[PDB]
Each structure stands twice: as structure tokens, then as C-alpha cells.
Amino acid sequence: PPRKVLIISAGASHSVALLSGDIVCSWGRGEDGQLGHGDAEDRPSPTQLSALDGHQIVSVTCGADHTVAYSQSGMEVYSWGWGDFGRLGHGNSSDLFTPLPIKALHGIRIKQIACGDSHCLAVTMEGEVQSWGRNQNGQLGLGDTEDSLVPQKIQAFEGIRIKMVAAGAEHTAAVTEDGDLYGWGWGRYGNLGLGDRTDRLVPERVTSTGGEKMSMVACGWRHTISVSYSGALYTYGWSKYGQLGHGDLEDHLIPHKLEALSNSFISQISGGWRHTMALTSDGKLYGWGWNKFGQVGVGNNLDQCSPVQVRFPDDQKVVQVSCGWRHTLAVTERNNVFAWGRGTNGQLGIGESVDRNFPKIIEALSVDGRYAVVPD
Amino acid sequence: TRYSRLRVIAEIRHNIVSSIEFDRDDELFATAGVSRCIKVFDFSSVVNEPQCPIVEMSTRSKLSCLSWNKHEKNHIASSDYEGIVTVWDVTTRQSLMEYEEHEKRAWSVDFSRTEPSMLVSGSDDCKVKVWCTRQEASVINIDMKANICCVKYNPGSSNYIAVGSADHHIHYYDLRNISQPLHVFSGHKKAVSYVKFLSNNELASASTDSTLRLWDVKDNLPVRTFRGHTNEKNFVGLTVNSEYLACGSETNEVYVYHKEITRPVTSHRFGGSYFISAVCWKSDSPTMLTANSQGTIKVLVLAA
Structure with a gap:
């Protein structure tokens, strides 16, 4: 029988999926080795990442040009791709083309791993956070700007249990299990929701929500998306292509409720380079923001400044979504994987190298x- | 004759640095490469302290070229492999401007010397684009029939540019009327990698055939040919002052030629399949910055 998709993820120009039986498949651009096949060759179609076979990989996430995965059964974290500046986690700046086990994080019960462009964070089961990579803009939350090659606990979160964290290019945003929202790092576009445009070296609580407790958070390049316990998106940051989806190109320095989607409960969010996706609890996928390559998946190449429902064949309900820098992937209730947006490196997994502006099925996975x- | 060797004055150990450039006052210098990071260093500190970048700007793409602004000391332009030409400010580490009209990798970017706000870029999409640092729309756009590897404003006037493309030629364009090149320079066997100007009238070019060539841009005739280095596949780097030329090699060494002598007047070995990635003369002074594929930056000085 077909092997269903358990998880999907997208990076700069590569995509990854975790399939039943814990089989890691990856495709797209691999010139930096982020595909984990031992070679720099691109993969226009989903290619089974054989290196991780039998490791009980429980989840996988993609950075800019690097990928990380973790197995709870083995209590191990593997990484490959662009791994210099310490984001590899091996104590050295190695950029090998195959998965390698991050020994600095061996034996840690990781609840989540978020990969930024040049840094990564790891939420453990105890609600702690450990961060590594480069700390030029203080995005690691260590209170100062020095690079770290080893997962270093964010002491700014002493005694605070964190539900999840999301990492952008140079900023991150943790969400406490109590519902608070934190933001730190590159904040020079209103990224952090702190009411100004200064980059912070420590996790700073975001007060501009009106008592609204936050459940999720997703960081793009220069914007952030936040979903409340019982509400909808609270987007903020840089809005030049409409990626905040408020009906205009005005940037917002604090969490600004996206009133257009106030009529539906939002189950998941995601943000790419300059676009945003929001998956409701009813299985409807709304997209907006930059649409130069068609990555909003609305059937055109015009930037969408307000949420637009992305239509799938036969009206399939979407159960998962993941936005790349210039492409997007979606897993539907029928275990069909659709991909749209930029595909010049075959990251769409269709087997071609052409750009699609609406959902296209990945037959090797659907x-x-x-x-x-x-x-020359 | 005055110089016969290169003395090392400093060194910075890391990878590959593709562009290294001094600023208008030659006090700072910026480096860019695979690191996706523009690192601005103070020259005096590098040559005195036994080094740490005084500014670091992070990017989301590997960089290809780098050009300081001439009358705005703090402004530096960069081109990445996704075709985004960004003008940064090193004082605030902010991207002052972002131009995204190139559909492919942008290979060269250059600020005009006479009109500081003009910025000419050339990309793999076979397009040369001229932007003004006042609007995000390409002020001029030249479509060509080959990949553009280098674009360079004439030092004496912003109305003339030299475009070194993969068409094995150098197109000298008069931007005031872009119908056909004001000149076309031939004689290069392989793609043209680097274009520089010794003066308002003397153009030096480096191709991927181990060949540098002078040219009288006032005329259409060449002047001289320089051989003695190795350059077949890599952007080894070219730099020029009013009298000397210097280039890298796939033999991890920098060759220095006089504009009147074809044989290299000298060379220096960095001392593995490494190669020299970037070179840059400090003004007309004999000092020079050089960088190989290890990310090792060395400061060299012509001496007897």
C-alpha cells in the first residue's frame, strides 16, 4: 500500500517529508547538501533519504539551506546541509552532505526543534529551550551577541515552560505554556511585537495583545504570525507585499488581529519569505502575501494583500501546510501532497522545473x- | 622595476571570500562570500592588532560582488545569487535599498564614481540594469544575448559602462543611447570574468583563459596581453590601480603585472586545491588585500 505522509517541511529551495514507518524523503535543491543524500545533485522528485532508515525519526524540519530531524525512540537529533556557524551542533562548522548525529544534544528529550536561517532552537519536554547557531542579532536569546556551537539553555526562561518556538531569518518568538508571547532577535521591522524597531538580545514579553493568550507562533522573514487560544491570526512586522494580510501594505509593530479571518478558528499557521498560510480547524487553507512565483496558490501571480482560500481538486480538506521561501506544500485529508509556488529547483517534487501558481499534486507521495x- | 616582491603585513584566518573592497577613504574594507555575510573590518586594526569584523550584515543568499559607495562613505552595494541587489548602511546594518528585477543570479554590482547614486549590475539572466539610489525601478535596462559576468562604470563618466559577458567579448555601452555597444572588444578566447578601468581611457579585462588584456576604450583597438597566471574555471579575482594589474590563480597565488610588461612583474604564494578568490588594490598605494578559498585574508605590499 501507499505510505502516508506524517510530516512535511520546506526550506529555501528544498522540501522534506516524513512518511509512515518513519521514512524520511527529501527533494528539491541539494547543492549545499541539505537533501542528505551524500551528493550535491538536485532531486526533482521525492527521493528517499536512506541514511535515516530505521532511526525512528519522529519529526523533521528544514532551515534555510540545512535540515534537522529528531527521533524520540533513539533520543537523537540529526542534521545536514549548511551547518557552519555552529547551527550544525557538532561543535564545529561542518557542512557535510549526509545526516550526522548532533552529540551535543544526545539524550535530551526534545519536544520540538525550530530551524532558523542560521540558528536553531530545541524545546525539551520540560518546557525549556536550548539554542545554538550564530548570535549576531541576539536571536539565540542568550542576552549577548556571541556565536554558540552548542545548544545553550536560554536562562532568560528560568522557570517558564514554553509550549513552542518559531525561528525566522534573524529573530525568534517563543510561546509559553501559560499563553504568553515572547520575541527576540532582529526586530528592526516590528518583527517582535514590542512596539518599536530595535533588535533584542533577550526574550521579551509581548504585551500588545489585550490579555489574549497565544497558542501558536510562526516567523517568516520580516513578519510573524500568532494564533490565540480561541481566536485567529495576530500578524505583525514588515508588510510590503501584503504578507500580513490586513488589506493594505502598512506594517504593524504590534500584534494586529487579522479581522478578515475572525470568522473561523485557525488550527495552524505558516510563513515563508514574504507569504503566509493559515489552515483553519475546518480544513480550509487561506493564503496571502507575495505571489510573484505563485506561491500563494490562488491561480495567479499577483500579490495578495488579504487572505484568499486556496482551492484543491474535489474540495479536499487540508490537514497540514508548510511554507518554503518561495514555495508551499500541503497534505490533505486524503493523504494527497500538493505543492505550488516556485519550482525552478524542482522543490515542488512534481518532477519538473517550472513554476506553478496553484496546488499541484505530488504523485510520488499522493x-x-x-x-x-x-x-561559459 | 621599483618592486620585485610582495611583503605580507597581516592575515585573517577563518569560507571562500569572493569580493573584498576598500571604501572611499580606504579606512575600512568589506568582505563577502559563501558566508552569506558582509563583514566590514577596520584596516588599521587588521594590520595592527594581532581582525574581528567591526560590522556584520547577514543575508539570505550567497554573495557574488560587492561595491562601496563613493561619496556616501557608509553605503555598500552587494549582489547575491538570487538576483537581489541590496544597498546596505554599515553604520546601522540596515538594507537601505533592495532591487529585485533580476530573474537569476546577479554576478556584478558597481557604484558609479562620478554620479554616486547610480548603480550598475549585471546578472546571469543576460541583463544589465542601472538603478538610481532614489527609486526601486531600474533606470536603464540593457538586454544582451549572453550571460553578464562583470559590469563596470567608466571612472570619468557615469554615461559609459563596460560589460564583460559570456559572449567572449566586452561591450562598451553609452547609456545615453543604448542601441548597439559603443564598442565591442574581442580577442578573449573564453568568457570574460572581470572588467576594470586603469583610467578614463584604459580598460583592463580578465577572462577564464589565463589572459588579461588592455584596451583603449577611446578607440576600438587593444593595447597589450598579459599571460603567466592560471585562470580556467574560477573567478580568481582582478584588481587594478593606475599602473599595475593583479589577479588570482587556481595555484593559490597572486600575480602582479605592469601595464607595459606582459610577463608578470611579480607573484606571491599563499602556501590542497585552493585558489585565490578576491583581490583589491588599496587606492594607488602598493598595499593590497587578497583572499583565497580557505577564507584566509592576507595584506600584501609591493616592495623591492
């Missing part, structure tokens, strides 16, 4: 069916 080189 049940239905170098550098400084002078050009």
Missing part, C-alpha cells in the same frame, strides 16, 4: 494519480 564558477 495516493491519487558550485561557487565562483565563471559561466
Whole structure:
């Protein structure tokens, strides 16, 4: 029988999926080794990442040009791709093309791992956070800007249990299990919801919600998306292409409720380079923001400044979504994987290298069916 | 004749640095490469302290070229492999401008010397674009029939540019009327990698055939040919002052030529399949910055 998709993720120009039986498949651009196949060759179609077979990989996430995965049964974390500046976690700046076990995080019961562009964070079962990578903008939350190659606990969260964290390019945003919202790092576009445009070196509580407790948080490049316990998105940050989806191109320095989606309960969110996706509890996928490559999946190439429902064939309900920098993936209630947006590196998994502006099925997964080189 | 060797004055150990450039006062210098990071260093500290970048700007793409602004000391332009030309401020580490008209990798970016706000870029989409640092729309757009590897404003005027493309030629364009190139320079066997100007009239170019060539842009005839280095596949780097030329090699060494002598007047070995990635003369002074594929930055000085 077909092997259903348990998890999906998207990075700069690569995509990854975790399939039943804990089989990690990856495709797209792999020139930096982020695909984990031992070679830099691109993969236009989903290619089974054989290196992780039998490791009981429980989840997988993708950074800019690096990927991380973790198995709870083995209590191990593997990483590959662009791993310098310590984001690899091996205590050295190695960029190997195959998964390697992060020994600095061996034996830690990881509840979640969020991969930023050049840093990663790991929420353990105890509600703690451990961060590593480069700390140029204080995004690691260590109170000061020095790089760290080893997962370092964020002492700013002493005694606070964190439900989840999301990492952007140079900023992050943790959400406490009590419902608070924290933001730190590159905050020079209103990214952090702190009411100004200064980058913070420590997790700072976001007071501009009106008592609203936050359940989820997703960080794009220069914007952030937040969902409340019983509400809808509270987007903020840079809004030049409408990625905040408030009907205008005005940026917001504090969590600003997205009133257009106030009529439906939002179950999941995601943010890419300059676009945003919001999956409701009813299985409807709304997309907005930058649409140059069609990554909003609304059937055109015009930037969408307000939420638009992305239509799937036969009206399939969407159970999962994940936005890349310039592409998006979605897993539907029928275990069909659709991909849209930019596909010049075949990250859409369709087997082609052309751009699609609306959901296209990945048949290999869906049940239905170098550098400084002078050009010649 | 005055110089016969290169003395090392400093060194910075890390990877590959593709562009290294001094600013208008030659006090600072910025480096960019695979790190996706523009690192601005103080030259005096580098040559005195036995180093740490005084500014670091992070990017979401690997960088290809880097150009300081001429009358705005703190402004530096960069081109990444996704075709985004960004003008940064090193004082505030902010992206002052972002131009995204290139559909592919942007190979070269250059600020005009006479009109500081003009910025010419050339990309793999076979497009040359001229932006003004007042609007986010390409002020001029030249479509060509080959990949553009280098674009360079004439030092004496912003109305003339030299475009070194993969068409094995250098197109000298008069931007006031872009119908056909004001000149076309041939004689290069492989793609043209680097374009520089010794003066208002002397153009130096480096191709991926181990060949540098002078050219009288006032005329259409060449002047000289320089051989003695190795350059077949890599952007080894080219730099020029009013009298000397210098280039990298796939043999991890920097060769220095006089504009009147074809044989290299000298060379220096960095001392593995490494190569020299970036080179840059400090003004007309004999000092020079050089960088190989290890990310090792060395400061060299012509001496007897």
C-alpha cells in the first residue's frame, strides 16, 4: 500500500517529508547538501533519504539551506546541509552532505526543534529551550551577541515552560505554556511585537495583545504570525507585499488581529519569505502575501494583500501546510501532497522545473494519480 | 622595476571570500562570500592588532560582488545569487535599498564614481540594469544575448559602462543611447570574468583563459596581453590601480603585472586545491588585500 505522509517541511529551495514507518524523503535543491543524500545533485522528485532508515525519526524540519530531524525512540537529533556557524551542533562548522548525529544534544528529550536561517532552537519536554547557531542579532536569546556551537539553555526562561518556538531569518518568538508571547532577535521591522524597531538580545514579553493568550507562533522573514487560544491570526512586522494580510501594505509593530479571518478558528499557521498560510480547524487553507512565483496558490501571480482560500481538486480538506521561501506544500485529508509556488529547483517534487501558481499534486507521495564558477 | 616582491603585513584566518573592497577613504574594507555575510573590518586594526569584523550584515543568499559607495562613505552595494541587489548602511546594518528585477543570479554590482547614486549590475539572466539610489525601478535596462559576468562604470563618466559577458567579448555601452555597444572588444578566447578601468581611457579585462588584456576604450583597438597566471574555471579575482594589474590563480597565488610588461612583474604564494578568490588594490598605494578559498585574508605590499 501507499505510505502516508506524517510530516512535511520546506526550506529555501528544498522540501522534506516524513512518511509512515518513519521514512524520511527529501527533494528539491541539494547543492549545499541539505537533501542528505551524500551528493550535491538536485532531486526533482521525492527521493528517499536512506541514511535515516530505521532511526525512528519522529519529526523533521528544514532551515534555510540545512535540515534537522529528531527521533524520540533513539533520543537523537540529526542534521545536514549548511551547518557552519555552529547551527550544525557538532561543535564545529561542518557542512557535510549526509545526516550526522548532533552529540551535543544526545539524550535530551526534545519536544520540538525550530530551524532558523542560521540558528536553531530545541524545546525539551520540560518546557525549556536550548539554542545554538550564530548570535549576531541576539536571536539565540542568550542576552549577548556571541556565536554558540552548542545548544545553550536560554536562562532568560528560568522557570517558564514554553509550549513552542518559531525561528525566522534573524529573530525568534517563543510561546509559553501559560499563553504568553515572547520575541527576540532582529526586530528592526516590528518583527517582535514590542512596539518599536530595535533588535533584542533577550526574550521579551509581548504585551500588545489585550490579555489574549497565544497558542501558536510562526516567523517568516520580516513578519510573524500568532494564533490565540480561541481566536485567529495576530500578524505583525514588515508588510510590503501584503504578507500580513490586513488589506493594505502598512506594517504593524504590534500584534494586529487579522479581522478578515475572525470568522473561523485557525488550527495552524505558516510563513515563508514574504507569504503566509493559515489552515483553519475546518480544513480550509487561506493564503496571502507575495505571489510573484505563485506561491500563494490562488491561480495567479499577483500579490495578495488579504487572505484568499486556496482551492484543491474535489474540495479536499487540508490537514497540514508548510511554507518554503518561495514555495508551499500541503497534505490533505486524503493523504494527497500538493505543492505550488516556485519550482525552478524542482522543490515542488512534481518532477519538473517550472513554476506553478496553484496546488499541484505530488504523485510520488499522493495516493491519487558550485561557487565562483565563471559561466561559459 | 621599483618592486620585485610582495611583503605580507597581516592575515585573517577563518569560507571562500569572493569580493573584498576598500571604501572611499580606504579606512575600512568589506568582505563577502559563501558566508552569506558582509563583514566590514577596520584596516588599521587588521594590520595592527594581532581582525574581528567591526560590522556584520547577514543575508539570505550567497554573495557574488560587492561595491562601496563613493561619496556616501557608509553605503555598500552587494549582489547575491538570487538576483537581489541590496544597498546596505554599515553604520546601522540596515538594507537601505533592495532591487529585485533580476530573474537569476546577479554576478556584478558597481557604484558609479562620478554620479554616486547610480548603480550598475549585471546578472546571469543576460541583463544589465542601472538603478538610481532614489527609486526601486531600474533606470536603464540593457538586454544582451549572453550571460553578464562583470559590469563596470567608466571612472570619468557615469554615461559609459563596460560589460564583460559570456559572449567572449566586452561591450562598451553609452547609456545615453543604448542601441548597439559603443564598442565591442574581442580577442578573449573564453568568457570574460572581470572588467576594470586603469583610467578614463584604459580598460583592463580578465577572462577564464589565463589572459588579461588592455584596451583603449577611446578607440576600438587593444593595447597589450598579459599571460603567466592560471585562470580556467574560477573567478580568481582582478584588481587594478593606475599602473599595475593583479589577479588570482587556481595555484593559490597572486600575480602582479605592469601595464607595459606582459610577463608578470611579480607573484606571491599563499602556501590542497585552493585558489585565490578576491583581490583589491588599496587606492594607488602598493598595499593590497587578497583572499583565497580557505577564507584566509592576507595584506600584501609591493616592495623591492
